[model samples]
Target chain A: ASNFTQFVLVDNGGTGDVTVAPSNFANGVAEWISSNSRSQAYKVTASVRQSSAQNRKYTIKVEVPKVATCTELPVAAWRSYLNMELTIPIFATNSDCELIVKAMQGLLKDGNPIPSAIAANSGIY
Target chain B: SNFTQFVLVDNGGTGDVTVAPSNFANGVAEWISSNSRSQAYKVTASVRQSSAQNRKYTIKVEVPKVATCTLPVAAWRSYLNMELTIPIFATNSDCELIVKAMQGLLKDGNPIPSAIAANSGIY
Candidate 1:
Protein backbone atom coordinates (compact mmCIF):
# COMPACT_ATOMS: atom_id res chain seq x y z
CA ALA A 1 0.00 0.00 0.00
CA SER A 2 1.96 2.93 -1.35
CA ASN A 3 0.82 6.49 -2.04
CA PHE A 4 2.00 7.85 -5.37
CA THR A 5 1.81 11.26 -7.01
CA GLN A 6 1.97 11.72 -10.78
CA PHE A 7 3.93 14.77 -11.88
CA VAL A 8 4.67 16.38 -15.22
CA LEU A 9 8.41 16.54 -15.77
CA VAL A 10 8.33 19.74 -17.79
CA ASP A 11 11.65 20.42 -19.45
CA ASN A 12 11.85 24.11 -20.16
CA GLY A 13 15.45 23.91 -21.36
CA GLY A 14 14.77 21.18 -23.97
CA THR A 15 17.11 18.88 -22.02
CA GLY A 16 14.40 16.25 -22.57
CA ASP A 17 12.22 14.91 -19.80
CA VAL A 18 14.08 12.18 -17.96
CA THR A 19 11.84 10.42 -15.48
CA VAL A 20 13.51 9.46 -12.15
CA ALA A 21 11.78 6.97 -9.97
CA PRO A 22 12.43 4.12 -7.54
CA SER A 23 13.70 0.97 -9.22
CA ASN A 24 13.22 -2.38 -7.45
CA PHE A 25 13.48 -1.26 -3.84
CA ALA A 26 16.88 0.26 -4.36
CA ASN A 27 16.24 1.49 -0.84
CA GLY A 28 17.22 5.14 -1.28
CA VAL A 29 18.14 4.97 -4.93
CA ALA A 30 16.35 7.02 -7.62
CA GLU A 31 16.76 6.16 -11.31
CA TRP A 32 16.00 7.92 -14.57
CA ILE A 33 13.55 6.44 -17.08
CA SER A 34 13.25 7.27 -20.77
CA SER A 35 10.52 9.68 -21.77
CA ASN A 36 7.24 8.27 -23.08
CA SER A 37 4.95 10.90 -24.68
CA ARG A 38 5.18 14.33 -26.28
CA SER A 39 4.64 15.92 -22.92
CA GLN A 40 7.02 13.50 -21.30
CA ALA A 41 9.42 13.91 -24.21
CA TYR A 42 11.07 16.95 -22.72
CA LYS A 43 13.72 16.26 -20.10
CA VAL A 44 12.16 15.50 -16.76
CA THR A 45 13.05 18.58 -14.88
CA ALA A 46 11.16 17.47 -11.79
CA SER A 47 9.16 14.55 -10.52
CA VAL A 48 6.19 14.04 -8.17
CA ARG A 49 5.93 10.63 -6.59
CA GLN A 50 3.88 9.04 -3.78
CA SER A 51 4.93 7.52 -0.50
CA SER A 52 4.07 3.93 0.24
CA ALA A 53 4.22 4.36 3.99
CA GLN A 54 0.93 5.35 5.63
CA ASN A 55 0.37 7.86 8.45
CA ARG A 56 3.66 9.44 7.50
CA LYS A 57 4.23 12.16 4.94
CA TYR A 58 7.25 12.15 2.65
CA THR A 59 9.04 15.22 1.40
CA ILE A 60 11.52 15.07 -1.47
CA LYS A 61 14.17 17.70 -0.93
CA VAL A 62 17.69 18.84 -1.74
CA GLU A 63 20.22 18.69 1.15
CA VAL A 64 23.48 20.57 0.67
CA PRO A 65 26.14 19.96 3.27
CA LYS A 66 28.73 22.73 3.50
CA VAL A 67 31.50 20.38 4.56
CA ALA A 68 32.10 16.66 4.57
CA THR A 69 34.23 15.47 7.46
CA CYS A 70 35.24 12.24 9.15
CA THR A 71 34.69 13.99 12.48
CA GLU A 72 32.80 17.12 13.56
CA LEU A 73 33.96 19.93 11.26
CA PRO A 74 33.42 23.58 10.28
CA VAL A 75 32.96 25.19 6.86
CA ALA A 76 33.30 28.80 5.83
CA ALA A 77 29.94 30.17 4.80
CA TRP A 78 31.44 32.45 2.17
CA ARG A 79 33.41 29.64 0.61
CA SER A 80 31.43 26.39 0.53
CA TYR A 81 27.95 27.21 1.85
CA LEU A 82 27.46 30.40 -0.12
CA ASN A 83 28.94 29.04 -3.32
CA MET A 84 26.85 25.90 -3.15
CA GLU A 85 23.66 27.93 -2.80
CA LEU A 86 24.66 30.31 -5.57
CA THR A 87 25.23 27.25 -7.72
CA ILE A 88 21.84 25.56 -7.24
CA PRO A 89 19.30 28.08 -6.10
CA ILE A 90 16.59 26.37 -8.14
CA PHE A 91 16.39 23.18 -6.08
CA ALA A 92 16.31 25.10 -2.82
CA THR A 93 13.25 27.09 -3.92
CA ASN A 94 10.81 24.68 -2.23
CA SER A 95 12.77 24.48 1.03
CA ASP A 96 11.73 20.84 0.90
CA CYS A 97 14.51 19.55 3.17
CA GLU A 98 13.96 22.19 5.83
CA LEU A 99 10.21 21.74 5.70
CA ILE A 100 10.43 17.99 6.08
CA VAL A 101 12.99 18.12 8.89
CA LYS A 102 10.85 20.57 10.79
CA ALA A 103 7.78 18.44 10.18
CA MET A 104 9.35 15.33 11.70
CA GLN A 105 11.82 16.81 14.12
CA GLY A 106 11.61 14.60 17.23
CA LEU A 107 9.96 11.49 15.83
CA LEU A 108 13.12 10.23 14.14
CA LYS A 109 16.63 9.34 15.22
CA ASP A 110 20.25 9.79 13.93
CA GLY A 111 18.85 12.50 11.61
CA ASN A 112 17.37 10.04 9.15
CA PRO A 113 13.63 10.59 8.85
CA ILE A 114 12.58 9.33 5.43
CA PRO A 115 9.08 7.86 5.27
CA SER A 116 8.65 4.07 5.03
CA ALA A 117 6.85 4.47 1.73
CA ILE A 118 9.96 5.88 0.11
CA ALA A 119 11.89 2.92 1.48
CA ALA A 120 9.27 0.41 0.35
CA ASN A 121 8.21 1.83 -2.98
CA SER A 122 9.22 -0.41 -5.93
CA GLY A 123 7.93 1.15 -9.13
CA ILE A 124 9.59 4.24 -10.60
CA TYR A 125 7.88 7.06 -12.45
CA SER B 1 29.50 22.58 -8.71
CA ASN B 2 27.66 20.53 -6.10
CA PHE B 3 25.79 21.58 -2.96
CA THR B 4 27.51 20.90 0.37
CA GLN B 5 26.68 21.28 4.04
CA PHE B 6 28.81 23.59 6.19
CA VAL B 7 30.59 23.08 9.50
CA LEU B 8 31.19 25.79 12.13
CA VAL B 9 33.71 24.21 14.49
CA ASP B 10 34.94 20.64 14.78
CA ASN B 11 36.73 18.26 17.17
CA GLY B 12 37.79 14.72 16.43
CA GLY B 13 38.39 13.21 19.84
CA THR B 14 35.60 14.38 22.11
CA GLY B 15 33.87 16.36 19.35
CA ASP B 16 33.84 20.00 20.46
CA VAL B 17 32.57 23.12 18.65
CA THR B 18 30.57 26.29 19.33
CA VAL B 19 28.19 28.65 17.49
CA ALA B 20 27.92 32.08 18.99
CA PRO B 21 25.42 34.81 18.13
CA SER B 22 27.40 35.58 14.98
CA ASN B 23 27.14 31.98 13.87
CA PHE B 24 23.39 32.04 14.50
CA ALA B 25 23.03 35.13 12.35
CA ASN B 26 25.65 34.59 9.65
CA GLY B 27 26.23 30.86 10.11
CA VAL B 28 29.87 31.18 11.24
CA ALA B 29 31.52 30.05 14.45
CA GLU B 30 33.20 32.58 16.74
CA TRP B 31 35.20 32.04 19.91
CA ILE B 32 35.95 35.05 22.15
CA SER B 33 38.52 35.09 24.95
CA SER B 34 39.77 37.97 27.14
CA ASN B 35 42.62 38.22 29.64
CA SER B 36 41.46 41.53 31.11
CA ARG B 37 40.67 43.95 28.27
CA SER B 38 40.31 43.24 24.53
CA GLN B 39 39.56 39.87 22.84
CA ALA B 40 41.31 37.46 20.50
CA TYR B 41 40.28 35.54 17.37
CA LYS B 42 41.06 32.01 16.30
CA VAL B 43 40.01 29.23 13.91
CA THR B 44 36.70 27.42 14.30
CA ALA B 45 38.51 24.50 15.90
CA SER B 46 40.48 26.73 18.26
CA VAL B 47 37.51 28.83 19.40
CA ARG B 48 36.14 25.91 21.33
CA GLN B 49 37.26 26.23 24.95
CA SER B 50 37.03 24.04 28.10
CA SER B 51 40.09 21.97 27.25
CA ALA B 52 40.38 18.92 25.00
CA GLN B 53 39.17 16.42 27.60
CA ASN B 54 36.13 18.45 28.59
CA ARG B 55 34.22 17.07 25.65
CA LYS B 56 31.35 19.25 26.85
CA TYR B 57 32.17 22.36 24.83
CA THR B 58 30.84 21.82 21.31
CA ILE B 59 29.15 23.93 18.65
CA LYS B 60 27.45 23.22 15.34
CA VAL B 61 26.11 25.77 12.88
CA GLU B 62 23.01 25.19 10.70
CA VAL B 63 21.70 27.79 8.28
CA PRO B 64 18.61 27.89 6.11
CA LYS B 65 18.86 26.92 2.46
CA VAL B 66 19.99 29.61 0.06
CA ALA B 67 19.18 30.14 -3.67
CA THR B 68 16.91 27.09 -3.86
CA CYS B 69 14.91 28.60 -6.69
CA THR B 70 17.77 28.00 -9.12
CA LEU B 71 19.16 24.79 -7.61
CA PRO B 72 18.94 21.71 -9.83
CA VAL B 73 16.61 18.78 -9.10
CA ALA B 74 19.39 16.20 -8.79
CA ALA B 75 20.60 18.71 -6.25
CA TRP B 76 19.12 16.24 -3.83
CA ARG B 77 21.84 13.77 -4.69
CA SER B 78 24.39 16.31 -5.83
CA TYR B 79 27.12 16.77 -3.20
CA LEU B 80 30.38 18.67 -3.10
CA ASN B 81 33.37 18.54 -0.73
CA MET B 82 36.36 20.90 -0.64
CA GLU B 83 39.07 22.37 1.53
CA LEU B 84 40.05 26.06 1.51
CA THR B 85 43.05 27.81 3.11
CA ILE B 86 42.17 31.31 4.35
CA PRO B 87 42.39 33.43 7.47
CA ILE B 88 39.31 33.61 9.66
CA PHE B 89 37.58 36.94 9.28
CA ALA B 90 36.00 38.94 12.05
CA THR B 91 32.71 40.66 11.20
CA ASN B 92 29.11 39.89 10.33
CA SER B 93 30.64 38.41 7.18
CA ASP B 94 32.12 35.35 8.90
CA CYS B 95 29.17 34.85 11.21
CA GLU B 96 27.58 31.88 9.46
CA LEU B 97 29.61 28.67 9.31
CA ILE B 98 28.47 25.10 8.64
CA VAL B 99 27.69 22.62 11.40
CA LYS B 100 29.07 19.11 11.81
CA ALA B 101 27.16 15.87 11.24
CA MET B 102 26.28 15.69 14.94
CA GLN B 103 25.16 19.29 15.05
CA GLY B 104 23.12 18.75 11.90
CA LEU B 105 21.50 15.81 13.62
CA LEU B 106 20.82 17.90 16.72
CA LYS B 107 19.47 21.04 15.09
CA ASP B 108 17.87 19.03 12.31
CA GLY B 109 17.91 15.48 10.99
CA ASN B 110 20.14 15.87 7.94
CA PRO B 111 20.05 12.16 7.16
CA ILE B 112 23.19 10.29 8.23
CA PRO B 113 24.23 6.80 7.15
CA SER B 114 21.98 3.93 8.17
CA ALA B 115 23.20 0.84 9.90
CA ILE B 116 19.85 -0.96 10.11
CA ALA B 117 17.43 -1.62 7.29
CA ALA B 118 14.57 0.86 6.63
CA ASN B 119 16.63 3.67 8.14
CA SER B 120 17.68 7.00 6.61
CA GLY B 121 21.10 7.25 4.95
CA ILE B 122 24.10 8.73 6.78
CA TYR B 123 26.22 11.70 5.72
Candidate 2:
Protein backbone atom coordinates (compact mmCIF):
# COMPACT_ATOMS: atom_id res chain seq x y z
CA ALA A 1 0.00 0.00 0.00
CA SER A 2 2.91 2.33 0.82
CA ASN A 3 5.04 3.16 -2.18
CA PHE A 4 7.18 5.40 0.05
CA THR A 5 7.89 7.84 -2.74
CA GLN A 6 10.16 10.86 -2.98
CA PHE A 7 9.21 13.97 -1.01
CA VAL A 8 10.50 17.48 -0.27
CA LEU A 9 11.57 18.51 3.22
CA VAL A 10 11.93 22.11 4.37
CA ASP A 11 15.20 22.69 6.17
CA ASN A 12 15.89 25.40 8.73
CA GLY A 13 18.51 27.21 6.64
CA GLY A 14 19.62 28.04 3.06
CA THR A 15 18.55 24.91 1.20
CA GLY A 16 14.86 25.24 2.01
CA ASP A 17 12.34 22.64 0.86
CA VAL A 18 15.04 20.29 -0.40
CA THR A 19 14.03 17.20 -2.28
CA VAL A 20 14.65 13.85 -0.65
CA ALA A 21 14.84 10.83 -2.96
CA PRO A 22 14.76 7.19 -2.00
CA SER A 23 18.25 5.74 -2.32
CA ASN A 24 17.31 2.18 -1.48
CA PHE A 25 14.25 0.26 -0.34
CA ALA A 26 14.93 -3.25 0.79
CA ASN A 27 14.22 -5.58 3.67
CA GLY A 28 11.10 -3.60 4.58
CA VAL A 29 13.19 -0.45 5.13
CA ALA A 30 13.78 2.54 2.87
CA GLU A 31 16.79 4.88 3.04
CA TRP A 32 16.53 8.42 1.69
CA ILE A 33 19.11 11.04 0.76
CA SER A 34 18.99 14.79 0.26
CA SER A 35 20.33 16.86 -2.70
CA ASN A 36 23.01 18.79 -0.83
CA SER A 37 26.18 17.32 -2.38
CA ARG A 38 28.80 19.31 -0.50
CA SER A 39 27.59 19.00 3.12
CA GLN A 40 28.05 15.23 3.16
CA ALA A 41 24.87 13.68 1.85
CA TYR A 42 22.98 12.70 4.96
CA LYS A 43 20.87 9.57 4.61
CA VAL A 44 17.66 9.00 6.54
CA THR A 45 16.02 5.63 6.94
CA ALA A 46 12.27 5.09 7.03
CA SER A 47 10.97 1.68 7.96
CA VAL A 48 7.60 -0.05 7.92
CA ARG A 49 7.84 -2.95 10.30
CA GLN A 50 5.27 -5.54 11.25
CA SER A 51 3.57 -4.80 14.55
CA SER A 52 0.47 -6.49 15.91
CA ALA A 53 -2.53 -7.47 13.81
CA GLN A 54 -4.33 -4.20 14.50
CA ASN A 55 -1.32 -1.90 14.05
CA ARG A 56 1.91 -1.39 12.14
CA LYS A 57 5.13 0.23 13.34
CA TYR A 58 6.21 3.06 11.09
CA THR A 59 9.59 4.48 11.98
CA ILE A 60 12.00 7.11 10.72
CA LYS A 61 15.61 7.14 11.78
CA VAL A 62 17.97 10.01 10.89
CA GLU A 63 21.68 9.61 10.26
CA VAL A 64 23.54 12.84 10.94
CA PRO A 65 26.76 12.90 8.93
CA LYS A 66 29.86 13.83 10.89
CA VAL A 67 33.67 13.87 10.66
CA ALA A 68 36.33 14.25 13.35
CA THR A 69 37.28 17.90 13.92
CA CYS A 70 40.67 17.85 15.70
CA THR A 71 42.27 14.81 14.02
CA GLU A 72 42.52 13.60 10.45
CA LEU A 73 39.21 12.40 9.10
CA PRO A 74 39.44 8.62 9.09
CA VAL A 75 36.14 8.21 7.32
CA ALA A 76 32.87 10.11 7.25
CA ALA A 77 30.76 8.67 10.02
CA TRP A 78 27.10 8.81 10.79
CA ARG A 79 26.78 10.13 14.34
CA SER A 80 23.18 10.02 15.49
CA TYR A 81 19.63 10.83 14.60
CA LEU A 82 16.37 10.83 16.48
CA ASN A 83 14.24 7.76 15.82
CA MET A 84 10.49 8.31 15.97
CA GLU A 85 7.78 5.72 15.50
CA LEU A 86 4.02 5.49 15.12
CA THR A 87 1.76 2.55 15.85
CA ILE A 88 -1.43 2.90 13.89
CA PRO A 89 -4.41 0.62 13.66
CA ILE A 90 -5.44 -0.41 10.15
CA PHE A 91 -9.12 0.28 10.60
CA ALA A 92 -8.81 4.09 10.93
CA THR A 93 -9.94 6.49 8.25
CA ASN A 94 -7.39 8.24 6.05
CA SER A 95 -9.32 11.52 6.32
CA ASP A 96 -8.98 11.42 10.07
CA CYS A 97 -5.31 10.62 9.49
CA GLU A 98 -5.05 13.73 7.34
CA LEU A 99 -6.71 15.82 9.98
CA ILE A 100 -4.38 14.44 12.63
CA VAL A 101 -1.26 15.20 10.59
CA LYS A 102 -2.34 18.74 9.67
CA ALA A 103 -2.97 19.77 13.23
CA MET A 104 0.21 18.09 14.43
CA GLN A 105 2.39 19.84 11.87
CA GLY A 106 0.77 23.18 12.64
CA LEU A 107 1.68 22.73 16.31
CA LEU A 108 5.42 22.82 15.44
CA LYS A 109 5.11 26.50 14.60
CA ASP A 110 5.19 29.26 17.22
CA GLY A 111 2.31 29.68 19.71
CA ASN A 112 2.76 26.00 20.50
CA PRO A 113 4.10 24.78 23.85
CA ILE A 114 6.53 22.23 22.34
CA PRO A 115 9.45 24.42 21.27
CA SER A 116 10.32 26.09 24.57
CA ALA A 117 9.59 22.93 26.55
CA ILE A 118 12.04 20.97 24.35
CA ALA A 119 14.64 23.75 24.06
CA ALA A 120 15.41 24.07 27.76
CA ASN A 121 13.45 21.14 29.17
CA SER A 122 11.29 23.70 30.97
CA GLY A 123 7.56 24.19 31.27
CA ILE A 124 5.74 26.44 28.79
CA TYR A 125 5.06 29.83 30.32
CA SER B 1 -2.99 -1.51 36.57
CA ASN B 2 0.35 -2.21 34.82
CA PHE B 3 -0.56 -5.76 33.87
CA THR B 4 -0.48 -5.19 30.14
CA GLN B 5 0.88 -8.10 28.11
CA PHE B 6 3.02 -7.34 25.08
CA VAL B 7 4.44 -9.69 22.44
CA LEU B 8 7.87 -8.45 21.40
CA VAL B 9 9.77 -9.70 18.35
CA ASP B 10 13.29 -10.93 18.80
CA ASN B 11 15.83 -10.43 16.02
CA GLY B 12 18.21 -13.01 17.43
CA GLY B 13 16.27 -16.21 18.06
CA THR B 14 12.97 -17.74 16.89
CA GLY B 15 10.33 -17.08 19.55
CA ASP B 16 8.83 -14.03 21.29
CA VAL B 17 10.66 -11.82 23.81
CA THR B 18 9.39 -12.86 27.21
CA VAL B 19 9.13 -9.93 29.65
CA ALA B 20 9.00 -10.81 33.32
CA PRO B 21 7.47 -7.63 34.75
CA SER B 22 8.19 -7.19 38.43
CA ASN B 23 8.89 -4.39 40.90
CA PHE B 24 6.65 -2.01 38.98
CA ALA B 25 5.24 -0.74 42.31
CA ASN B 26 8.80 0.47 43.03
CA GLY B 27 8.59 2.56 39.80
CA VAL B 28 10.48 0.20 37.47
CA ALA B 29 9.03 -2.65 35.40
CA GLU B 30 11.98 -4.83 34.41
CA TRP B 31 12.07 -7.61 31.80
CA ILE B 32 15.09 -9.87 31.37
CA SER B 33 15.99 -12.19 28.50
CA SER B 34 15.46 -15.54 30.25
CA ASN B 35 17.54 -17.75 27.93
CA SER B 36 20.75 -19.36 29.18
CA ARG B 37 23.02 -16.76 27.69
CA SER B 38 26.20 -15.64 29.44
CA GLN B 39 24.72 -12.17 30.00
CA ALA B 40 21.00 -11.51 29.86
CA TYR B 41 19.49 -8.26 28.58
CA LYS B 42 17.46 -6.38 31.21
CA VAL B 43 15.03 -3.80 29.91
CA THR B 44 13.00 -1.33 31.93
CA ALA B 45 10.36 1.18 31.02
CA SER B 46 10.58 2.96 34.35
CA VAL B 47 8.06 5.55 35.48
CA ARG B 48 8.64 8.66 37.53
CA GLN B 49 6.05 10.75 39.34
CA SER B 50 6.95 14.33 38.64
CA SER B 51 5.43 17.67 39.60
CA ALA B 52 6.52 19.35 36.36
CA GLN B 53 4.03 19.22 33.54
CA ASN B 54 6.61 18.99 30.76
CA ARG B 55 8.86 15.99 31.12
CA LYS B 56 10.89 14.08 28.52
CA TYR B 57 11.51 10.50 27.47
CA THR B 58 14.92 8.86 27.22
CA ILE B 59 16.35 5.42 26.30
CA LYS B 60 19.42 3.55 27.53
CA VAL B 61 21.29 0.36 26.46
CA GLU B 62 24.17 -0.70 28.72
CA VAL B 63 26.91 -3.30 28.06
CA PRO B 64 29.59 -3.69 30.68
CA LYS B 65 33.13 -5.08 30.65
CA VAL B 66 33.54 -8.64 31.85
CA ALA B 67 36.41 -10.33 33.78
CA THR B 68 36.41 -13.71 32.04
CA CYS B 69 34.82 -15.73 29.24
CA THR B 70 33.32 -19.18 29.76
CA LEU B 71 32.27 -22.09 27.49
CA PRO B 72 29.01 -20.37 26.60
CA VAL B 73 31.02 -17.43 25.20
CA ALA B 74 30.00 -14.54 27.44
CA ALA B 75 29.09 -11.93 24.89
CA TRP B 76 28.27 -8.41 26.00
CA ARG B 77 24.59 -8.06 26.82
CA SER B 78 23.53 -4.49 26.14
CA TYR B 79 20.45 -3.60 28.13
CA LEU B 80 18.05 -1.52 26.08
CA ASN B 81 15.86 0.57 28.37
CA MET B 82 13.37 3.19 27.26
CA GLU B 83 12.04 6.15 29.27
CA LEU B 84 9.02 8.27 28.54
CA THR B 85 7.04 10.96 30.38
CA ILE B 86 3.92 12.43 28.87
CA PRO B 87 1.94 15.55 29.72
CA ILE B 88 -1.18 15.07 31.82
CA PHE B 89 -3.59 15.57 28.93
CA ALA B 90 -1.66 14.44 25.86
CA THR B 91 -3.87 12.68 23.35
CA ASN B 92 -3.26 9.80 20.98
CA SER B 93 -3.66 12.05 17.92
CA ASP B 94 -1.06 14.53 19.14
CA CYS B 95 1.67 11.89 19.49
CA GLU B 96 1.10 10.35 16.05
CA LEU B 97 1.87 13.65 14.33
CA ILE B 98 5.32 13.87 15.88
CA VAL B 99 6.32 10.44 14.58
CA LYS B 100 4.92 11.06 11.10
CA ALA B 101 6.89 14.30 10.79
CA MET B 102 10.02 12.70 12.17
CA GLN B 103 9.75 9.61 9.92
CA GLY B 104 8.24 11.18 6.80
CA LEU B 105 4.48 11.06 6.37
CA LEU B 106 3.47 11.75 2.79
CA LYS B 107 1.15 14.63 1.95
CA ASP B 108 -0.96 12.69 -0.55
CA GLY B 109 -2.31 10.43 2.25
CA ASN B 110 -2.38 7.52 -0.21
CA PRO B 111 0.55 5.67 1.36
CA ILE B 112 -1.57 4.93 4.43
CA PRO B 113 -2.26 1.21 4.79
CA SER B 114 -5.92 0.46 4.31
CA ALA B 115 -8.24 -2.44 3.49
CA ILE B 116 -11.00 -2.10 6.06
CA ALA B 117 -11.37 1.64 6.57
CA ALA B 118 -13.48 3.25 9.28
CA ASN B 119 -14.57 6.79 10.08
CA SER B 120 -13.50 6.35 13.67
CA GLY B 121 -9.93 7.19 14.62
CA ILE B 122 -8.77 3.58 14.55
CA TYR B 123 -5.39 4.85 13.31
My TM-score estimates for the predictions, one after another, are 0.17, 0.39
lDDT per residue for candidate 1 within A12-88, as digits (tens), equals 55554333442222222222233332222222122222211111122233222222333654342222111111112
Docking class of 2: incorrect
DockQ computed for model 1 against the true two-chain complex using alpha carbons: 0.01
Can you list the residue pairs that collide in candidate 2? Answer: none
Best by TM-score: 2
Give the number of the best model, judged by lDDT. 2
Q: Chain B in candidate 2 has what TM-score?
A: 0.49
Misplaced by over 4 Å in model 2 are A1-3, A12-17, A35-39, A65-80, A120-125, B1-123
Residues A1-125 of candidate 2: C-alpha lDDT, one tens digit per residue: 14556776547666554667777654445677875453555667765533544455677787666655547544455655578777766577899778867876887766567875877778877
Model 2 Cα shift for residue A82 (angstroms): 0.6
